Amino acid sequence: HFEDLEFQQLEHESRLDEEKENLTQQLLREVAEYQRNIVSRKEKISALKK
Amino acid sequence: DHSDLVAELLKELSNHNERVEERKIALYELMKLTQEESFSVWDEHFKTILLLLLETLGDKEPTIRALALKVLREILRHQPARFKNYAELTVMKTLEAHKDPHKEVVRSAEEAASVLATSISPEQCIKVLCPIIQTADYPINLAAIKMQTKVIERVSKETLNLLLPEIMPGLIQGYDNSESSVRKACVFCLVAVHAVIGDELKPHLSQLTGSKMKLLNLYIKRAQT
Ligand SMILES: [Cl-]
């Protein structure tokens, strides 16, 4: 009974840090996707040159 | 001696949704002869008795459902070797009872589940719980996670490592579940996993955020002390 409430308060005491880390993980995935998009296009540009 | 009683127990228990008092007594007599280990005809009648008992879990009367779970619990305790071929069926029936509207049925199912987790083959039980943990609805998924924890407490390092690719995805996903009870159950399960393989759990948790890792490590350092 009390163990459930302690767990729930430990989550709340890090709620802000939780959201910043989740957002960071999303931003890191988007960057990684954009980096692959650049590699893909640079390969085309290189091939279209000669 | 007992074979005459069994005949009564069978024909009475097959009376679904009728004669409540007569079936309670038959269930109590069966349960009493199981605890006393006086039932010398398990080798002859176990299969039929079990199947009639599992069908009784779906009775209209909640008092019947709760009692049948209590009987199942004692049969699991004294005759666990006979559930080898009915392991999957028994697990799913016991877990399903956890979503019963009546609290006495749920409580009996929880008691039966705790015994079941230690009366069943460790490897077999994990492989049937993994798809349940990931797909089933609350609180059946919650019950499955708790049952998995009890099983992991009874396995070796090598046995667990060969089952980790099936276990981990459900626990990671469960840590992000809506229900706080499910999230808490997943943390405790991970603690049980860490108790076995140690710091070999770290690379499997590369997806978890910093604060989620700190909460897990909080319960890990709490367990070992
Ligand atoms: Cl039989």
UniProtKB/Swiss-Prot annotation, chain A:
- Domain of life (superkingdom): Eukaryota
Q: Where is it localised? A: Cytoplasm; Cytoplasm, Cell cortex; Membrane; Cell projection, Podosome
Q: Which pairs of Cys residues are joined through disulfide bonds in the record?
A: none
Q: How does it assemble?
A: Interacts with FLNC. Interacts with AMOTL2; interaction may facilitate PHLDB2 localization to the myotube podosome cortex that surrounds the core. Part of a cortical microtubule stabilization complex (CMSC) composed of KANK1, PPFIA1, PPFIBP1, ERC1/ELKS, PHLDB2/LL5beta, CLASPs, KIF21A and possibly additional interactors; within CMSCs KANK1 and PHLDB2/LL5beta appear to be the core components for targeting of microtubule-binding proteins KIF21A and CLASPs, whereas PPFIA1, PPFIBP1 and ERC1/ELKS serve as scaffolds for protein clustering.
Q: What role does it play?
A: Seems to be involved in the assembly of the postsynaptic apparatus. May play a role in acetyl-choline receptor (AChR) aggregation in the postsynaptic membrane.
Task: Reproduce the free-text note on domains from the UniProt record.
Answer: The PH domain mediates the binding to phosphoinositides.
Q: What's the protein called, per UniProt?
A: Pleckstrin homology-like domain family B member 2
Originating organism:
Homo sapiens
- Counting on the full-length protein, the chain here runs from 721 to 770 of 1253
Curated annotation (Swiss-Prot), chain B:
PTM comment, free text: Phosphorylated by GSK3B. Phosphorylation reduces MAPRE1 binding. Phosphorylation by GSK3B may negatively regulate binding to microtubule lattices in lamella.
Source organism's superkingdom? Eukaryota
Q: Where in or outside the cell is it found?
A: Cytoplasm, Cytoskeleton; Cytoplasm, Cytoskeleton, Microtubule organizing center, Centrosome; Chromosome, Centromere, Kinetochore; Cytoplasm, Cytoskeleton, Spindle
Region annotated Required for cortical localization, chain positions: 1-225
Return the HEAT repeat spans. 1-37, 44-81, 162-199
Q: List the disulfide bonds.
A: none
Q: In which tissues is it expressed?
A: Brain-specific.
Q: Give the residue spans that cross the bilayer.
A: none
**Subunit architecture:** Interacts with microtubules. Interacts with MAPRE1; probably required for targeting to the growing microtubule plus ends. Interacts with CLIP2, ERC1, MAPRE3, PHLDB2 and RSN. The interaction with ERC1 may be mediated by PHLDB2. Interacts with GCC2; recruits CLASP2 to Golgi membranes. Interacts with MACF1. Interacts with mtcl2 and MTCL1.
Record's domain comment?
The two SXIP sequence motifs mediate interaction with MAPRE1; this is necessary for targeting to growing microtubule plus ends. Two TOG regions display structural characteristics similar to HEAT repeat domains and mediate interaction with microtubules.
State the family it belongs to: Belongs to the CLASP family.
Function description: Microtubule plus-end tracking protein that promotes the stabilization of dynamic microtubules. Involved in the nucleation of noncentrosomal microtubules originating from the trans-Golgi network (TGN). Required for the polarization of the cytoplasmic microtubule arrays in migrating cells towards the leading edge of the cell. May act at the cell cortex to enhance the frequency of rescue of depolymerizing microtubules by attaching their plus-ends to cortical platforms composed of ERC1 and PHLDB2.
Name of this chain's protein: CLIP-associating protein 2
This protein's species is Homo sapiens
Give me the gene this protein comes from. CLASP2
Show which stretch of the intact protein is covered: 1055 to 1279 of 1294
